[PDB]
Symmetry: C8
Subunit: 62 residues, 8 copies
């Protein structure tokens, strides 16, 4: 993996969107623009996580 | 493995269901929503574990 | 190996069964239910070890 | 990966261009010349990042 | 290598047989039963080592 | 990678040549002879970097 | 590499034989029996080194 | 790479030959015999390095 990035994008398609976020090298960030989502989709996976589950996933990606 | 996640989802098809859970980077979490299960099934395996065996698996998975 | 598990299931088909056990990440456990055996067979190998040899294998997986 | 380089080029196709930049082994640099962009595109990925998201990516990429 | 085992079985086909033995994660053990030999042949290689050479191999294999 | 070398050759085809250089295992060197360039091109990549960008790349390969 | 062995067998076909030797996990040993040579040829490479060069190779495999 | 060797042979086809040499696990050695060159060409690459560039390569290869 030449990119130097490990992690994933996450979002929900449920009624209660939080937009897109990512874990990148163990750091959680918000992604504001569509362009950046598409850019990182070239190099890391993009999965669905419901709003109610984000807190637990945060615990495990710490 | 670009995702930065090692682990697995687990559930039982037996009578005493505990829903879905996962080990994610050595942290055990409960998973509240179907969308999250399907999200993580994109990047980690999903296996069956009896209610009766979770305690021993917990011991191995720190 | 995305599962975060290294190890193997072991059992004997000799007259003197000890059921199924596993080394998971260097930790020995007993597996009580058939469902759990089949689940872990999705991600780690499953080999035969006679009852008389388990003590030596324990020494080496310590 | 024989190059000894992990990282990526990034740029925006939006209105507020910042040219090309890169993370190379966790160091952020600006890239002044087209020849260098084309050189590094031989060994590292090249993705789109909005001007608005660079600050968060910076935080993840140390 | 998902098994968490690195090592090999060894035996001699010469006149002074010592049965089967193995190095498993740098620990030397004797193997008492055919079932165990066949089990481990599923996950580690099995080679020939003369009785006369075991002492030197021991020195290398710590 | 059996060669024990990670890095790359770099040069510019711009008007202002600095000849060939390389980062080899994090050490920057000049390559004076054509024979050596061709030799290392057998084992590491060879990319273009403009003279104006070498200073930044040096910073990141430190 | 599941064998837990890194190294090589070496011998000379020059007039001045030293028999077979090996570096196994950074430890030099002599191999006395043909059976052991053939056994290790299943898992590590077997190359030619002249008697006059063994001293230098020893220096580098230390 | 099962050999436990990382490195390369080097020589020059220029007028000032130094014979064959190698870096083997970060140690530079001279190689006295053709048989050894052919042996190591089985496990490590063999490249051209001008007499004039050896000093710089030495600096990188520690």
């Amino acid at each position: 993996n030449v990119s130097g990035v490990q992690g994933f994008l996450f979002h929900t398609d449920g009624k209660e969107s939080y937009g897109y976020r990512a874990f990148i090298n163990g750091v959680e960030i918000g992604i504001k623009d569509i362009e950046t989502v598409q850019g990182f989709q070239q190099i890391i996976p993009s999965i669905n996580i419901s709003h109610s589950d984000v807190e637990a996933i945060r615990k495990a990606m710490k």
